[PDB]
Design an enzyme around this catalytic site. Sequence first.
Site, PDB file in Angstrom:
ATOM      1  N   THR A  95      -5.913   6.536   7.984  1.00 46.86           N
ATOM      2  CA  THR A  95      -6.390   6.842   6.625  1.00 46.86           C
ATOM      3  C   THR A  95      -6.386   5.637   5.684  1.00 46.86           C
ATOM      4  O   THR A  95      -6.704   5.774   4.517  1.00 46.86           O
ATOM      5  CB  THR A  95      -5.615   7.997   5.979  1.00 46.86           C
ATOM      6  N   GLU A 136      -2.975  13.975   1.871  1.00 48.58           N
ATOM      7  CA  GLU A 136      -4.272  13.476   2.341  1.00 48.58           C
ATOM      8  C   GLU A 136      -5.056  14.611   2.991  1.00 48.58           C
ATOM      9  O   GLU A 136      -6.142  14.978   2.545  1.00 48.58           O
ATOM     10  CB  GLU A 136      -4.053  12.296   3.281  1.00 48.58           C
ATOM     11  N   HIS A 176       5.452   6.617   7.468  1.00 47.94           N
ATOM     12  CA  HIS A 176       5.205   6.289   6.076  1.00 47.94           C
ATOM     13  C   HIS A 176       4.685   7.500   5.353  1.00 47.94           C
ATOM     14  O   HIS A 176       4.433   8.549   5.959  1.00 47.94           O
ATOM     15  CB  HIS A 176       4.209   5.125   5.940  1.00 47.94           C
ATOM     16  N   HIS A 182       0.839  -1.214   0.000  1.00 44.64           N
ATOM     17  CA  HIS A 182       0.000   0.000   0.000  1.00 44.64           C
ATOM     18  C   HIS A 182       0.875   1.266   0.000  1.00 44.64           C
ATOM     19  O   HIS A 182       0.597   2.237  -0.697  1.00 44.64           O
ATOM     20  CB  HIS A 182      -0.950  -0.038   1.191  1.00 44.64           C
ATOM     21  N   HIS A 231       3.491  10.665   7.516  1.00 43.94           N
ATOM     22  CA  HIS A 231       2.762  10.332   8.730  1.00 43.94           C
ATOM     23  C   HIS A 231       3.664   9.587   9.706  1.00 43.94           C
ATOM     24  O   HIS A 231       4.090   8.472   9.432  1.00 43.94           O
ATOM     25  CB  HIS A 231       1.539   9.474   8.446  1.00 43.94           C
ATOM     26  N   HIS A 246       2.315   9.213   1.933  1.00 42.08           N
ATOM     27  CA  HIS A 246       1.320   9.149   0.867  1.00 42.08           C
ATOM     28  C   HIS A 246       1.682  10.159  -0.195  1.00 42.08           C
ATOM     29  O   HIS A 246       2.164  11.234   0.114  1.00 42.08           O
ATOM     30  CB  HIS A 246      -0.091   9.463   1.392  1.00 42.08           C
TER      31      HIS A 246
END
Length: 257
Positions: free
Chosen positions: A195, A103, A91, A61, A116, A93
């Site tokens: 999330t 996000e 991690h 992911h 995050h 996004h």
Amino acid sequence: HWGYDKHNGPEHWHKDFPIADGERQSPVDIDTDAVDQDPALKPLALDYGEATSDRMVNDGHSFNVEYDDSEDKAVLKDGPLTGTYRLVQFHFHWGSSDDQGSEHTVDRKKYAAELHLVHWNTKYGDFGTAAQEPDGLAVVGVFLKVGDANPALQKVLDALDSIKTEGKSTDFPNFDPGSLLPNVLDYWTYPGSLTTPPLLESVTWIVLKEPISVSSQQMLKFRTLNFNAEGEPEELMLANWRPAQPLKDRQVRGFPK
Ligand SMILES: [Zn+2]
């Protein structure tokens, strides 16, 4: 299994994980006109000097940098929080082009990516147990704004060739997560969730107002990762951001205002 594809993406998550339509879902848009001051809020306290990074892992992911959380070596305190929170991992996004990928958004403005830093409340025995409680997790969100190349970030990106596919991990010692912080810790805070599935409503969000930098060339590296495992058909990790969810009956608070 859930993903970010047209047929397993954020728009579909609510089927397998109905809490997707919960009262406190993340991320959200931060409307700066609607942010409240609160004298109970304190300056954010980060104590990362003793942090020891373990490894970097591609979980299909995103990718995660894991940390030793067996003792109070990398802890988060104060801000909106009570007690001690241990750093377990961070991690990222990102999106398919530089104009999108964060996000959280600020007055609808999207950054190219978001970091995050995930922490758990030592009042509970471990991460898993903490995640099940509304006061269990604290996540520090840091925007990545396109501009100057970031040498701290580059150390992370230099490892990605080693973990291109789902399930791959590599040794990643001596990474200071404090090196991925901006030099001002002003923040927004609100109660929310993870999330990603299982979207647990156990996160006190602490979104830093001031971004760190990333170059457009550096952003190219993020998108060379694979969602897929080795041997499976190629699917590039082009985008892995959940869109802004409704704020509903929550209030975003700001420190120092
Ligand atoms: Zn995240």
